[PDB]
């Protein structure tokens, strides 16, 4: 049989960015899995005054914001005929310029903020860290080890929004073969990643990964060492690394283009001055542990930073234990850089992410008279307030090579070959094939996860890239499982 | 409510506001059934032992299918569909380890 127990935080008053200590008590013989439970408090941006027209104010990430004068372009110079600029809410509601406390920015959490939260998890036994891991290896085992059947619930565990399916009414369609009723299927999200004026308190249930979490039979005994010796130190993310602000004000331009056809074009551009978000109050900070009442696979990880241009090779000697598989993740440091406007969207993405922008525009052509009907008399071209943004993740590696000492082993394999064929062919049912080109899998010793028996065993990671060098660097993340013996 | 909007100006002297606007909605809107939880805390009270005692609904309904059952148990999309484990692993082998 088994039951569950709670662990109160030993630190006292958790705060984001500060270390939390949890203490394992003595209540049984075996304990393997555990979950840190937090209730992050409600957040909202501060009230901000509506800007005056013709004023340029310094915005976030070194990018200047501006509210242009009438008859000018966006940059408040190079005049554009017919341009008229007003202020609107993100849902189209007018905002009067110069109003005191006129709008709020829309706070939205990170994508997978639960993995971002546990930035440094460490298991200490009077020092001497048995396992220390970070958010990047958690993202790696998300993209590889989670089966994908149990994803949405996992998306509920780490606070990621899950798409909800809706349907329109019945619609007429013609069937061509060489008249029918169909319903369109739409999808829409509601979670913390959707920008809201008032984010509700978000409940995060974060699993802890160690060598004994894989199986129930691998749980370490609690009688060999005293319970007043084991601690868990979690260094959390900053308040600026979890919630971001979305523009609560949009400069709307209406441009009238005269002649024939007479066009009215409505376009939008966000006005994003950084406001103040209230402090997140962590609530109900518990540590659920399963207690059972009656050699090993260790995530030996190391994440390093590389700055060389168009080709690189590192130096390392720490890994000595035999391995079974080898998971690689290359992330440009601009993904997690604070100067990135999309760093909350892209902190977890292994690859170079460009943005593809659909601008869904409503078009209409109206003729006022029936004599000159060749061209429309007037046209309307109305864009949406916020466009449709697709994060397109392009690979950075052109060739990968893990050069060993006496053997070359992996030598200049293509990135797509590894990243697609190796997860597809190896791993059994456990390893999901990732959607990110920078999430790579390479095999050294045997089949990754099918049985508990080693059939054989035995590392400078290097690459040739087309990515830039000192302008934007790249970091490597590993989740290779080493085989360790305890005696 | 997917609504098409259009702004038409008949003339080029007063172009500040549109002369006419069209706001046409669809006949039938787009309806999303949003399934919100009803339970705040679940508890299966046994006779001599309390067993499950005031666990949150999200904890059960999300973490228990995610962690237990092997590849057989799909994690439900409904918050009111919870899973609770009493004796052993749900479906991995034909051998009881306890009850």
């Amino acid at each position, epitope marked *: 049989g088994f039951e569950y127990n709670k662990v109160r935080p030993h630190t006292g008053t958790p705060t984001l960015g500060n270390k939390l200590t949890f203490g394992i008590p003595q209540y049984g013989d075996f304990f393997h899995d555990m979950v840190g439970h937090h209730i992050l408090g409600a957040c909202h941006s501060s009230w901000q005054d509506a800007p*005056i*027209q*013709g*004023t340029s104010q310094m915005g976030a990430h070194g990018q200047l914001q501006t509210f242009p004068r009438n008859g000018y372009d966006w940059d408040n110079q190079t005049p554009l005929e017919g341009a008229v600029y007003t202020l609107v809410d993100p849902f189209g509601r007018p905002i009067v310029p110069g109003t005191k406390n006129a709008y709020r920015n829309l706070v939205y959490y990170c994508e997978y903020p639960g993995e971002r939260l546990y930035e440094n998890v460490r298991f200490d036994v009077n020092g001497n860290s048995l396992d220390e891991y970070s958010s990047d290896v958690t993202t790696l085992v998300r993209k590889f080890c989670i089966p994908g059947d149990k994803m949405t619930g996992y998306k509920h565990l780490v606070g990621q929004e899950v798409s909800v399916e809706g349907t329109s009414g019945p619609l007429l369609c013609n069937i061509h073969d060489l008249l029918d009723i169909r319903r369109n299927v739409h999808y829409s999200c509601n979670g913390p990643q959707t920008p809201k004026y008032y984010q509700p308190p978000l409940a995060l249930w974060i699993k802890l990964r160690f060598w004994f979490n894989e199986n129930v039979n691998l749980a370490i005994p609690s009688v060999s060492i005293p319970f007043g010796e084991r601690f868990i130190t979690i260094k959390l993310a900053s308040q600026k690394d979890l919630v971001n602000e979305f523009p609560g004000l949009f400069v709307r331009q209406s441009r009238f283009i*005269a002649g024939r056809p007479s066009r009215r074009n409505i376009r939008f551009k966000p006005w994003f001055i950084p406001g103040v978000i209230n402090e997140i109050s962590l609530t109900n900070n518990e540590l659920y542990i399963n207690n059972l009442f009656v050699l090993i696979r260790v995530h030996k990880t190391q994440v390093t930073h590389t700055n060389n241009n168009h080709h690189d090779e590192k130096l390392m000697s720490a890994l000595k234990w035999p391995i079974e598989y080898m998971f690689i993740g290359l992330k440009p440091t601009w993904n997690i850089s604070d100067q990135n406007p999309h760093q909350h969207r892209d902190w977890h993405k292994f690859g170079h992410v460009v943005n593809a922008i659909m601008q869904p525009t409503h078009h209409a052509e109206i003729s006022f008279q029936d004599r000159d009907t060749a061209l429309p008399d007037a046209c309307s071209s109305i864009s949406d307030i916020s466009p449709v943004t697709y994060p397109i993740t392009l690979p950075i590696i052109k060739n990968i090579s893990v050069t060993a000492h006496g053997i070359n082993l992996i030598d200049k394999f293509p990135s797509k070959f590894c990243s697609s064929y190796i997860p597809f062919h190896y791993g059994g049912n456990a390893i999901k094939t990732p959607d990110d080109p920078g999430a790579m899998m390479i095999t050294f010793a045997l089949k990754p996860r099918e049985e508990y028996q080693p059939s054989g065993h035995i590392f400078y990671i290097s690459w040739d890239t087309d990515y830039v060098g000192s302008i934007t660097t790249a970091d490597l993340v590993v989740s290779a499982s080493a085989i360790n013996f305890l005696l | 409510q997917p609504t098409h909007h259009a702004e038409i100006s008949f003339q080029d*002297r*007063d172009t*500040a506001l549109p002369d006419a606007c069209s706001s046409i909605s669809d006949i039938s809107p787009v309806t999303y059934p949003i399934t919100l939880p009803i339970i705040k805390n679940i508890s299966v009270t046994a006779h001599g032992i309390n067993l499950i005692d005031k666990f949150p609904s999200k904890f059960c309904s999300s973490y228990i299918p995610f962690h237990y059952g092997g590849n057989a148990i799909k994690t439900p999309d409904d918050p009111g569909a919870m899973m609770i484990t009493f004796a052993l692993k749900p479906r991995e082998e034909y051998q009881p380890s306890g009850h």
Partner: antibody, heavy 123, light 111 residues
Framework: EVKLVESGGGLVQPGGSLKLSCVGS????????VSWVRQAPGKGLEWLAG??????????YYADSVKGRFTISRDNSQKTAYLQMNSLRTDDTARYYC???????????????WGPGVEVVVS | DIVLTQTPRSLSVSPGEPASISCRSS??????????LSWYQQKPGQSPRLLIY???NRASWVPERFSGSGSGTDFTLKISRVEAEDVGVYYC?????????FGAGTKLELK
């Protein structure tokens, strides 16, 4: 190019009323705040009145010396602004300008575009 | 309300020499992090023309000899080298809130 034309001032007895038109050709005159400004002879410039553009409202703002006596308006169909002087006294002889801020609300606007103005003499 | 006082009335500065124009306000002219004083130049026989907006910025036509005044309640326009086309009348204009006001008006003429 944004242009403004004022019309017009003339010989007016010390009891009367005037209707000054300011016609604008700038393709955004209907969304541009319009101010009326006075320069008396032997005196510096003196702000008189201001009015907003379309979008947000049509509020009018007035100098305390001529508040109630003056009536500002605008007709955007002909791209014109209007200044009505009622019961103007003998010190109202001055050069009058209409200025067109390239901005909607007249709260903190900068008077960029001007016109030649008209000289109103009161006698 | 706010009254703007121009301490210099006439300078009579030599050509090629710097000139200074002072304007003081009743209280602070600053709102939303930017000053709201403007400077206007009127040449003899010409309509008024915007010289400086927001007390530190300038129009597109402005050559590189007009300083961006100061900050707070006191401002001082400075011309580095008068080029004999700067002879005229300069005004400091309130842009905080209506009713806006003009300065006394300082006449610059060479000597």
């Amino acid at each position: 190019e944004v242009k403004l034309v004022e019309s017009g001032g003339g010989l007016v007895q010390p009891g009367g009323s005037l209707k000054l038109s300011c016609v604008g050709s700038g393709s955004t005159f209907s969304s541009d705040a319009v101010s009326w400004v006075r320069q008396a002879p032997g005196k510096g410039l003196e702000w008189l009145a201001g009015i907003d553009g379309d979008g947000g409202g049509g509020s009018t703002y007035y100098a305390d010396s001529v508040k109630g006596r003056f009536t500002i308006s605008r007709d955007n169909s002909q791209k014109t602004a209007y200044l009505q002087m009622n019961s103007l006294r003998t010190d109202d002889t001055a050069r009058y300008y209409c200025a067109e801020c390239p901005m909607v609300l007249l709260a903190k606007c900068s008077m960029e575009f001007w016109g030649p103005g008209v000289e109103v003499v009161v006698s | 309300d706010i009254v703007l006082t121009q301490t210099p009335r006439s300078l009579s500065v030599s050509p090629g020499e710097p000139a200074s124009i002072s304007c003081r306000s009743s209280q602070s002219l600053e709102e939303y992090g930017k000053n709201w004083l403007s400077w206007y130049q009127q040449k003899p026989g010409q309509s008024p023309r915007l010289l400086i907006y927001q007390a530190t910025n300038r129009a597109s036509w402005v050559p590189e000899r007009f300083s961006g005044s100061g900050s707070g309640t006191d401002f001082t326009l400075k011309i580095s080298r008068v080029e004999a086309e700067d002879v005229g009348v300069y005004y400091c204009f309130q842009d905080l809130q209506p009713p806006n006001g003009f300065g006394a008006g300082t006449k610059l003429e060479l000597k």
